[PDB]
């Protein structure tokens, strides 16, 4: 959920106070005052849409930063920055291959933790082996100790 909380960070927080007032409104129909699954149904009919107990509960999961089983206010910010289809360039076989050429610096086919640390250190931004290794895992669903390209897709899926 660090993408939605980064949007929170990268965007202004007065929109977040706006969503706080909207969440105060989201006590209406809320036997909890919050946005739970049922409360997401009623908040969305208060918001205009209506997701499903799976869609409401999954947005909950999709806003479960803490795993609070609800859409909390912070989770409601996540929601408002979460209910569309925008993450672009769909980097896949073609584009993530263009990338994997450098992700897998090796010109071989595996972003090992060294390939990943090198690519990150090349990003210019601050790099941690927490970063490098969490991203290894996001890769290493096959768990090669080294991000394969399928691991690379389980890692950078849609991410741009």
């Amino acid at each position: 959920d660090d993408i939605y909380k980064a949007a929170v960070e990268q965007l202004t927080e007065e929109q977040k106070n706006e969503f706080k007032a909207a969440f105060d409104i989201f006590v209406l129909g809320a036997e909890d005052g919050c946005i739970s699954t049922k409360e997401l149904g009623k908040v969305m009919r208060m918001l205009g849409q209506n997701p499903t107990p799976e869609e409401l509960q999954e947005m909950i999961d999709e806003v479960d930063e803490d795993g609070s089983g609800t859409v909390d206010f912070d989770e409601f910010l996540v929601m408002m920055v979460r209910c569309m289809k925008d993450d672009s360039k769909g980097k896949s076989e073609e584009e993530l291959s263009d990338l994997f050429r450098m992700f897998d610096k090796n010109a071989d086919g595996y972003i090992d933790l060294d390939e990943l640390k090198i690519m990150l250190q090349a990003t210019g931004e601050t790099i941690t082996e927490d970063d490098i290794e969490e991203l290894m895992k996001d890769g290493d669903k096959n768990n090669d100790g080294r991000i394969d390209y399928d691991e690379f897709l389980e890692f950078m899926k849609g991410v741009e």
């Binding site: 706006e18 909207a22 205009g48 408002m80």
Partner: peptide
């Protein structure tokens, strides 16, 4: 959001 909030059309 716009047509709903009318004069206060703010969120989206």
């Amino acid at each position: 959001m716009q047509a709903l909030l009318g004069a206060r059309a703010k969120e989206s």
